[PDB]
Amino acid sequence: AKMAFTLADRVTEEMLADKAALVVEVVEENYHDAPIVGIAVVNEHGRFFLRPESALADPQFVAWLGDETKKKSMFDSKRAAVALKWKGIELCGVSFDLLLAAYLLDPAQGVDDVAAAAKMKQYEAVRPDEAVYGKGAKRAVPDEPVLAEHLVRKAAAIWALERPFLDELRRNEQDRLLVELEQPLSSILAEMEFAGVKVDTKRLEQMGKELAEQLRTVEQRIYELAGQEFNINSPKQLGVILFEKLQLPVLKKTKTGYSTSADVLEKLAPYHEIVENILHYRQLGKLQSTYIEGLLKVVRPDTKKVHTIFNQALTQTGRLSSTEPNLQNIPIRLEEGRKIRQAFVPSESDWLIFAADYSQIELRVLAHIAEDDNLMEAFRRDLDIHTKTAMDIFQVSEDEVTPNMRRQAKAVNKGIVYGISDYGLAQNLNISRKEAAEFIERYFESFPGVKRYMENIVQEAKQKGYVTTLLHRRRYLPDITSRNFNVRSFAERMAMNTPIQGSAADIIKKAMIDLNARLKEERLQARLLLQVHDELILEAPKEEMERLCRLVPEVMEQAVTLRVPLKVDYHYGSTWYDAK
DNA sequence: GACCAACCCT
DNA sequence: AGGGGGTC
């Protein structure tokens, strides 16, 4: 049932209306320096398909793309915007992004194409991308009539669905969240991804060489200690060596066999010297395969940069994620892995890396939303929150908090944030369930506002069907009324955690927007490179460091006003590693 | 190609 | 709480 459209050979004026749905199709998953395979425009004058070689060489089309007063409705405008950046072309005037609209309305739908968004409004006259392009090894751009019809159907769907999505967003009080936060963020993210992060590949290659050697040493030790050679990475062979040949106790069983997770191996260590070597082996192998080799695979040889993609429409809480590479999980906890960060360097000579991070943003949001007097006081006094929680739950003075007490109060604080239960805290602290329940009980005795919040939010999630964040992000929790304890309990944890994690995500997004405007106003050459949930990483000329020291924390702290202050710490240095 | 245990981050 | 090799 073909949809009517003009398969245009040249760009004409009626294609350049000041309101249109626009599709700029980039089929490669990684859109950096990738082909644009076709273009489609739908507006008041009709529906059009243009070949990219024609349209992107046409000066009037390029000027239309870059004209802020010519409004476009798209799906996943950052994909388009980034692909066009690599071709030297600017995309402006995107006033509606259907991907981001669908994500705000319900993140649980997993909307990743136009067809999935359209289904939300009983619009089905468009195919899923997976049906048009196929999947896996059979993934292919189809021939032009099939391609052109698909792109026009997508554009037509966008044109049809804008009004219904914006109506619903408004009813939800999410219209400003789309227009003033997620859409402008999307363009900031596009700049970040495009700029990329410079990598010292030589330093990485030498790290790889050293690891290679330490891995050979530990691997031989392991075969010496096992008394035979085997695939250390094989769960079958390793399970046989540990739990049969060597008779180590079986403390945990996997669905398919013996468990060898790090928590289990740490318990087995006293019984045999093989265990610490296996652990060290896995630590090095992780660094080698994921971080040295993985990173070296994705660095662009021409520029020596990595260009991540930030998925802004994926997480259930409002966080971003990062892929190919993931720059939000670069090792930091153990010193040997943290050195990987010495390979991330400024993109120009005499530039430095600058990192700013919120101090305990999740707990401070909790203090604000729960209005707990004790917690709010703690933050208003800028106390070490974990020491203070130790003092209250153990009923001791600051002098009497031992390192183990602080470690445990810390785990409780994480637990309260992730809404965990006597059971989940017990596993984390390696203790009994009754003991955990005693900690939680003491916590709530000291922070009765937090308890009140946890109760109130679970009830609100049951009453309304969802919970919300500070800036009106939403998460639907239909399992909250389940009669199955485990399923219900998980939904309740989500009710408790989501306004905390999600409101934190809202605040840092708003900081990024405010910061980008300030950097411009000041005409600084400093640029945002990365976000890592509660921190922003920038590069700038050494001559701008002193100004950034004042400017960046202040923008991040003033992003919203909460009942308690926000606090931002910062550092800078020659490499990401040194920015500590 | 798809899963799953495993492990890196906040 | 939220993400991003071996074995069939």
Residue A395: CATH number of its domain: 1.10.150.20
SS3 track for A514-555: HHHHHHHHCCCCCEEEEECCCEEEEEEEHHHHHHHHHHHHHH
Q: Is the CB of A285 under 7 A from strand B?
A: no
Helices (H), A248-307: 262-268, 274-286, 294-298
**Listing from the earlier edge strand, what are the strands of the sheet with A197-199?**
A305-306, A197-199, A344-345
What 8-state DSSP symbol labels residue A35?
A: P
Of the candidates A103, A1, A68, A477, the residue with the CA atom closest to the CA atom of residue A320: A103
Residue A11: CATH number of its domain: 3.30.420.10
Structure tokens, A106 = 């319900």
Q: Is A343 helix (H, G, I), strand (E, B) or coil?
A: helix
| DSSP β-ladder status, A305-306 and A309-311 | unpaired
Q: Which residue is nearest to nucleotide B2 (CA to C1')?
A: A136
In angstroms, what CA-CA distances link A288 with A207, A208, A213, A284, A420?
9, 6, 11, 6, 34
A282-287: list long-range contacts, CB under 8 Å, 24+ apart. A283/A334, A283/A336, A283/A337, A284/A211, A284/A214, A284/A215, A284/A218, A284/A336, A285/A215, A285/A233, A286/A337, A287/A211, A287/A331, A287/A336, A287/A337, A287/A340
End-to-end CA distance of chain A: 61
Torsion angle, CA of A267/A269/A270/A276, rounded to 10 degrees? -160
Q: Are A179 and A504 in contact (CB under 8 A)?
A: no
Block residue for tokens 């260590």:
A269
In whole angstroms, give the CA distance from residue A28 to residue A35: 8
- Rounded to the nearest 5 degrees, what angle is found at the Cα of A499, between the Cα atoms of A497 and A505? 100
- Which positions ≥6 away from A465 have C-beta within 8 Å? A476, A477, A478
Chain-centre distance for alpha carbon A552: 21
Q: Are A355 and A578 in contact (CB under 8 A)?
A: no
Do A148 and A225 have their domain in common? Answer: no
Task: Pick out the nucleotide with least CA–C1' distance to A361.
Answer: B10
Do A320 and A214 have their domain in common? Answer: no
Q: Is the CB of A484 under 7 A from strand B?
A: no
Of the candidates A189, A179, A291, the residue with the CA atom closest to the CA atom of residue A512: A189
In whole angstroms, give the CA distance from residue A187 to residue A33: 17
Q: At what angle do helices A144-171 and A98-105 cross, to 10 degrees?
A: 40
Do A166 and A226 have their domain in common? Answer: no
**Partners of A21 in the β-ladder:** A42, A73
Q: Which residue is nearest to nucleotide C8 (CA to C1')?
A: A256
Classify burial at A297, counting beta carbons within 10 Å of its beta carbon; exposed 0-12, middle 13-18, buried 19 or more: exposed
| DSSP β-ladder status, A197-199 and A568-573 | unpaired
Range of the domain at A64: 1-194
Half-sphere exposure at residue A385, Cβ-oriented, CA atoms within 13 angstroms: 22
**Partners of A119 in the β-ladder:** none
What phi and psi values does residue A29 have, to the nearest 5 degrees? -60, -50
Q: Which residue is nearest to nucleotide C4 (CA to C1')?
A: A326
Task: Pick out the nucleotide with least CA–C1' distance to A254.
Answer: B5
How many separate helices (H) and strands (E) can be counted in chain A? 24, 17
Do A270 and A356 have their domain in common? Answer: no
Do A448 and A427 have their domain in common? Answer: yes
Experimental method: X-ray
- Rounded to the nearest 5 degrees, what angle is found at the Cα of A515, between the Cα atoms of A511 and A517? 125
Tell me the Ramachandran region of residue A288: left when phi exceeds 0, alpha when psi lies from -120 to 50, beta otherwise.
alpha
In whole angstroms, give the CA distance from residue A308 to residue A321: 10
Residues in A 94-123 whose C-beta is less than 7 A from nucleic strand B are: none
Do A165 and A36 have their domain in common? Answer: yes
In angstroms, what CA-CA distances link A482 with A489, A491, A518?
9, 9, 48
Peptide bond into A145 cis (omega under 30): no
What phi and psi values does residue A440 have, to the nearest 5 degrees? -50, -45
The one-letter amino acid at A234: S
Total length of chain A: 580
- Rounded to the nearest 5 degrees, what angle is found at the Cα of A314, between the Cα atoms of A497 and A297? 120
Q: Which of A275, A292, A309 is the last residue of a domain?
A: A309
Structure tokens, A535 = 């921190």
In whole angstroms, give the CA distance from residue A44 to residue A14: 9
Task: Pick out the nucleotide with least CA–C1' distance to A289.
Answer: C5
Q: Is A37 helix (H, G, I), strand (E, B) or coil?
A: coil
In whole angstroms, give the CA distance from residue A340 to residue A301: 19
Q: Is A95 helix (H, G, I), strand (E, B) or coil?
A: strand
Q: Is the CB of A424 under 7 A from strand B?
A: no
Do A1 and A146 have their domain in common? Answer: yes
A328-CA/B9-C1' distance, Å:
6
Structure tokens, A89 = 């072309």
Of the candidates A13, A19, A15, A69, the residue with the CA atom closest to the CA atom of residue A39: A15
- Which positions ≥6 away from A289 have C-beta within 8 Å? none
| DSSP β-ladder status, A19-25 and A71-74 | parallel
Task: Pick out the nucleotide with least CA–C1' distance to A252.
Answer: B5
Do A89 and A228 have their domain in common? Answer: no
Residues A110-133, buried b or exposed e (16+ Cβ, 10 A)?
A: ebbbbbbbbbbbebeebbebeebb
Query: What single string gives the DSSP state of each residue in A436-504?
Result: HHHHHHHHHHH-HHHHHHHHHHHHHHHHHSEEE-TT--EEE-GGGG-SSHHHHHHHHHHHHHHHHHHHH
Q: Are A376 and A370 in contact (CB under 8 A)?
A: no
Q: Which residue is nearest to nucleotide B7 (CA to C1')?
A: A286
Query: What single string gives the DSSP state of each residue in A20-33?
Result: EEEEEE--SSS-TT
Residue A258: CATH number of its domain: 1.20.1060.10
Half-sphere exposure at residue A447, Cβ-oriented, CA atoms within 13 angstroms: 33
A229-CA/B8-C1' distance, Å:
28
Tell me the Ramachandran region of residue A577: left when phi exceeds 0, alpha when psi lies from -120 to 50, beta otherwise.
alpha
Nucleotides of chain C touched by protein CB (<7 A): 1-8
The residues close to strand C, meaning Cβ under 7 A, are: A 231, 233-237, 289, 293, 311, 314-317, 319, 321-324, 326, 328-329, 418-420, 490, 493-494, 497, 501, 533
What 8-state DSSP symbol labels residue A10?
A: S
- Which positions ≥6 away from A402 have C-beta within 8 Å? none
Of the candidates A358, A357, A352, the residue with the CA atom closest to the CA atom of residue A544: A352
How many distinct structural domains can be found in chain A? 4
Do A190 and A204 have their domain in common? Answer: no
In whole angstroms, give the CA distance from residue A465 to residue A168: 16
Helices (H), A114-182: 114-119, 129-133, 144-171, 175-176
Q: Are A567 and A556 in contact (CB under 8 A)?
A: no
Q: Which of A292, A309, A326 is the last residue of a domain?
A: A309
| DSSP β-ladder status, A466-468 and A568-573 | unpaired
Residue A569: CATH number of its domain: 3.30.70.370
Do A150 and A247 have their domain in common? Answer: no
In angstroms, what CA-CA distances link A514 with A27, A105, A180, A181, A519?
33, 24, 11, 10, 9
Q: Which of A470, A489, A504 is the last residue of a domain?
A: A504
Q: Which residue is nearest to nucleotide B1 (CA to C1')?
A: A136
In angstroms, what CA-CA distances link A488 with A118, A480, A481?
30, 5, 6
| DSSP β-ladder status, A46-50 and A38-43 | antiparallel
Do A59 and A164 have their domain in common? Answer: yes
What 8-state DSSP symbol labels residue A287?
A: I
Q: Are A368 and A564 in contact (CB under 8 A)?
A: yes
Structure tokens, A78 = 């950052």
A44-CA/C1-C1' distance, Å:
46
Q: Is the CB of A335 under 7 A from strand B?
A: no
Half-sphere exposure at residue A174, Cβ-oriented, CA atoms within 13 angstroms: 24
A250-CA/B5-C1' distance, Å:
16
Classify burial at A268, counting beta carbons within 10 Å of its beta carbon; exposed 0-12, middle 13-18, buried 19 or more: buried
Structure tokens, A142 = 């189809």
Block residue for tokens 């398919």:
A256
Nucleotides of chain B touched by protein CB (<7 A): 1-2, 4-10
Q: Is the CB of A88 under 7 A from strand B?
A: no
Q: Are A33 and A196 in contact (CB under 8 A)?
A: no
Q: Is the CB of A334 under 7 A from strand B?
A: yes
Of the candidates A555, A472, A540, A577, the residue with the CA atom closest to the CA atom of residue A508: A555
Q: Are A320 and A310 in contact (CB under 8 A)?
A: yes
Resolution in A, one decimal?
2.2
Of the candidates A161, A143, A145, A148, the residue with the CA atom closest to the CA atom of residue A39: A148
Do A28 and A139 have their domain in common? Answer: yes
